[PDB]
Design an enzyme around this catalytic site. Sequence first.
Site, PDB file in Angstrom:
ATOM      1  N   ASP A 171      -8.616  -0.884  -8.012  1.00 26.25           N
ATOM      2  CA  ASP A 171      -7.973  -1.252  -6.861  1.00 26.25           C
ATOM      3  C   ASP A 171      -7.665  -2.704  -6.693  1.00 26.25           C
ATOM      4  O   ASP A 171      -6.680  -3.401  -6.200  1.00 26.25           O
ATOM      5  CB  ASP A 171      -8.938  -0.826  -5.647  1.00 26.25           C
ATOM      6  CG  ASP A 171      -8.154  -0.743  -4.484  1.00 26.25           C
ATOM      7  OD1 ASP A 171      -6.933  -0.558  -4.294  1.00 26.25           O
ATOM      8  OD2 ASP A 171      -8.893  -0.510  -3.511  1.00 26.25           O
ATOM      9  N   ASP A 197      -5.431   5.492  -1.136  1.00 26.30           N
ATOM     10  CA  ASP A 197      -4.746   4.579   0.284  1.00 26.30           C
ATOM     11  C   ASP A 197      -3.745   5.750   0.635  1.00 26.30           C
ATOM     12  O   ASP A 197      -2.740   4.872   1.346  1.00 26.30           O
ATOM     13  CB  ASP A 197      -3.916   3.568  -0.319  1.00 26.30           C
ATOM     14  CG  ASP A 197      -4.926   2.468  -0.403  1.00 26.30           C
ATOM     15  OD1 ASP A 197      -6.043   2.428   0.451  1.00 26.30           O
ATOM     16  OD2 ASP A 197      -4.823   1.485  -1.009  1.00 26.30           O
ATOM     17  N   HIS A 222       0.811  -1.067   0.035  1.00 27.41           N
ATOM     18  CA  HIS A 222       0.080   0.010  -0.025  1.00 27.41           C
ATOM     19  C   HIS A 222       0.739   1.311  -0.331  1.00 27.41           C
ATOM     20  O   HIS A 222       0.948   2.197   0.857  1.00 27.41           O
ATOM     21  CB  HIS A 222      -0.942   0.133   1.046  1.00 27.41           C
ATOM     22  CG  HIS A 222      -1.982  -0.947   1.192  1.00 27.41           C
ATOM     23  ND1 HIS A 222      -2.183  -2.354   1.645  1.00 27.41           N
ATOM     24  CD2 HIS A 222      -3.282  -0.964   0.215  1.00 27.41           C
ATOM     25  CE1 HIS A 222      -3.027  -3.046   1.460  1.00 27.41           C
ATOM     26  NE2 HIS A 222      -3.735  -2.105   0.651  1.00 27.41           N
ATOM     27  N   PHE A 279      -8.582 -15.901  -3.247  1.00 24.64           N
ATOM     28  CA  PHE A 279      -8.814 -14.610  -3.616  1.00 24.64           C
ATOM     29  C   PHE A 279      -9.540 -14.127  -4.936  1.00 24.64           C
ATOM     30  O   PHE A 279     -10.558 -13.445  -5.208  1.00 24.64           O
ATOM     31  CB  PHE A 279      -7.554 -13.699  -3.594  1.00 24.64           C
ATOM     32  CG  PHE A 279      -7.593 -12.107  -3.869  1.00 24.64           C
ATOM     33  CD1 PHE A 279      -8.595 -11.599  -3.181  1.00 24.64           C
ATOM     34  CD2 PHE A 279      -6.525 -11.798  -4.703  1.00 24.64           C
ATOM     35  CE1 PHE A 279      -8.556 -10.147  -3.316  1.00 24.64           C
ATOM     36  CE2 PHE A 279      -6.660 -10.357  -4.798  1.00 24.64           C
ATOM     37  CZ  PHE A 279      -7.667  -9.669  -4.199  1.00 24.64           C
ATOM     38  N   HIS A 322       1.487   1.153  -5.847  1.00 24.52           N
ATOM     39  CA  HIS A 322       0.167   0.919  -5.821  1.00 24.52           C
ATOM     40  C   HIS A 322      -0.943   2.032  -6.352  1.00 24.52           C
ATOM     41  O   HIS A 322      -1.866   1.771  -7.061  1.00 24.52           O
ATOM     42  CB  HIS A 322      -0.388   0.335  -4.439  1.00 24.52           C
ATOM     43  CG  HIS A 322      -1.751   0.014  -4.172  1.00 24.52           C
ATOM     44  ND1 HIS A 322      -2.378  -0.631  -5.120  1.00 24.52           N
ATOM     45  CD2 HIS A 322      -2.496   0.625  -3.384  1.00 24.52           C
ATOM     46  CE1 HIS A 322      -3.799  -1.051  -4.750  1.00 24.52           C
ATOM     47  NE2 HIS A 322      -4.160  -0.007  -3.803  1.00 24.52           N
ATOM     48  N   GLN A 361      -4.123 -16.829  -3.290  1.00 22.41           N
ATOM     49  CA  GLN A 361      -4.447 -16.326  -4.657  1.00 22.41           C
ATOM     50  C   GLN A 361      -5.672 -17.113  -5.403  1.00 22.41           C
ATOM     51  O   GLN A 361      -6.495 -16.176  -5.986  1.00 22.41           O
ATOM     52  CB  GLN A 361      -3.250 -16.190  -5.449  1.00 22.41           C
ATOM     53  CG  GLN A 361      -2.199 -15.062  -5.092  1.00 22.41           C
ATOM     54  CD  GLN A 361      -2.666 -13.868  -4.792  1.00 22.41           C
ATOM     55  OE1 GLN A 361      -3.486 -13.455  -5.673  1.00 22.41           O
ATOM     56  NE2 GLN A 361      -2.480 -13.238  -3.478  1.00 22.41           N
TER      57      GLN A 361
END
EC number: 3.1.4.53
Lengths: 325, 318
Positions: A232, A115, A74, A286, A78, A283
């Site tokens: 995002d 962010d 972050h 996700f 990013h 992953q």
Amino acid sequence: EQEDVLAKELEDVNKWGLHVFRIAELSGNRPLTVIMHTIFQERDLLKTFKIPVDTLITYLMTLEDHYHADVAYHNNIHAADVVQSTHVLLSTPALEAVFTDLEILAAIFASAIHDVDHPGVSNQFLINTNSELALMYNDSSVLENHHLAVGFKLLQEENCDIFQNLTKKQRQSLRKMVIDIVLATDMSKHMNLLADLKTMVETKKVTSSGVLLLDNYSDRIQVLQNMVHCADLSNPTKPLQLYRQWTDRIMEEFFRQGDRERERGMEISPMCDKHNASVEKSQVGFIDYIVHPLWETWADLVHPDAQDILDTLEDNREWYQSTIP
Amino acid sequence: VLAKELEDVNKWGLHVFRIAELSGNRPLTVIMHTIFQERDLLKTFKIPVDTLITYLMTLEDHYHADVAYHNNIHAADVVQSTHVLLSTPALEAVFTDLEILAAIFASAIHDVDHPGVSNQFLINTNSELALMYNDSSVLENHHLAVGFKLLQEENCDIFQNLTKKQRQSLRKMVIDIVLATDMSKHMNLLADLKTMVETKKVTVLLLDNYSDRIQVLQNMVHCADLSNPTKPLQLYRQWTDRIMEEFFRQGDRERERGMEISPMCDKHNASVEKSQVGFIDYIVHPLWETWADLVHPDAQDILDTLEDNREWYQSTIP
Ligand SMILES: COc1cc2c(cc1OC)[C@H](CCc1c[nH]c3cc(C)ccc13)N(C=O)CC2
Ligand SMILES: COc1cc2c(cc1OC)[C@H](CCc1c[nH]c3cc(C)ccc13)N(C=O)CC2
Ligand SMILES: [Mg+2]
Ligand SMILES: [Mg+2]
Ligand SMILES: [Mg+2]
Ligand SMILES: [Zn+2]
Ligand SMILES: [Zn+2]
């Protein structure tokens, strides 16, 4: 010479899979500044909104400074990646001429700040540790409220008000849209956001020219909210050599949070225990439970504009899955 | 003396201004202390009475003495009003002792550090508060943040002997309650109260899930926040005097800044009496009539006084 190579890499700014890590290196760890400046030039935003170039650079450099260079995911790379991905999603044919210049400015600005000053730990961690941020924000979208507050506050620094030449109505509208967009990046809103996106897809209306019909604020902001949310959550939709670096960085951040949860006797957050983590299965889960459901729905909204991105996502899911057995 | 008036603590129409004067301008403290004893809260939750006092004093100190309405007397009044509403017969022990503690604590902090100007004023003047809170329930987020932060002062953590899960539960309920005191949420809140009335189940009210029970507690404190016109006229008139003073001082600030003057805030162009009748007709009576329906008919005397007070204010208009 290094500026020439950077200029060559920035020629990819309208392409999915821009080499954002190369751009961060070639720009002297200024990817957010150079990519934002490039996009503002590409979309003629300095002329449209009478933004002084020196004011834009000064704000961008200050904003970029308030991303933590010591947070693995972050950080300013990013932020630059979400900015550039939103910029590409705004250019999708299904949305041609749909949004005003002010809405485009709002979406890109929201992505840049979305962010800022992220400490590299989650909302739940900040709540559970009785952090000053969670105390300030009453446990509600703690990080996202903070990113907004910092992103707007820095406009008040010397020669940083990039919106100085907007009308008061323009500033008020932009501010509300930016707040609405960044608050929608709270992952605890993902399910409700996807539910609404699905509803819009099944009731979608198009115009005579074939672009999406959005005739009210609610529909318009909801598309911009899901667009920045897709941006995002776009890492698994990028070329694999980019995706794997993002996976490395988020796992580093997760593991560091898990180390602090462990040293505190707290239950370790999911995917944060470096002694009992499966990066590959995480992953796949996700993608399967969050990223593909979202991008499948976005792809339906703009069909068939996003088919190549959806295909990359599916290839990458197969690849991560193939490394499990 | 002060002890004399405090015996009415279970009564609608407590003499809160007298208590405020007799207590040395500590109505919030002595009324909160008295209510905790009346409900057995210091022993139910192992609260050291000195810790209770030290917190309540610090909290009271963070209400502004130079703000005519949104001060510590108002906080005391809402605390005591909620306390009474918690004893509505139709709500016989419907809430747990933690839900009771949360509603009372929420009432006590619900306006702390109020600057005497509206959310809209703070937004339109680009205040630090509105920048911090992204124009969203600006005051109410701040009241909560201050209310909770003061628990971290020396000997101020009245929740120190709550378990970890009790604190987390209490915190969430208090936040949910105070955020619902934002007047921009009144209509959605009333709609939920109405729905609950149209689907009410009874033996006494049967509320099974947290969502319905937090809604009642939100509308409860909202009712206690908007209870001034339901009190005895001598109290109501002093509340009207105070809110109009605070409104006019905001309209003066709006004028000296050359911004648009907020409704009811133009001292050179305000009818105090017509505003009260309009306040009752559009906000306070719809809310209290819906609440009266929910607890049918335990709110009859409150709704009666409200209609008595509305008739009087209407009679002062020529
Ligand atoms: C490249 O990979 C990642 C990138 C990101 C995340 C996780 C990644 O990989 C596991 C997490 C998502 C956390 C999360 C919230 N709800 C969830 C539900 C499930 C089922 C899984 C994860 C989550 N992020 C945190 O800021 C965003 C970026
Ligand atoms: C004693 O009397 C008062 C007490 C209070 C108010 C107004 C009073 O009297 C006009 C206002 C209500 C604001 C408000 C929001 N929408 C409204 C619509 C109408 C029609 C009227 C007022 C309002 N408060 C401000 O914090 C709460 C206490
Ligand atoms: Mg975020
Ligand atoms: Mg209030
Ligand atoms: Mg039950
Ligand atoms: Zn992000
Ligand atoms: Zn109040």
